[PDB]
């Protein structure tokens, strides 16, 4: 989850 969001922001 952590990296999925970073990713899409
Ligand atoms: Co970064």
Not at 1 to 9: G, M, R, S, V
Request: no cysteine; proline share 0%.
């Amino acid at each position: 989850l952590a990296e999925a969001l970073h990713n899409a922001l």
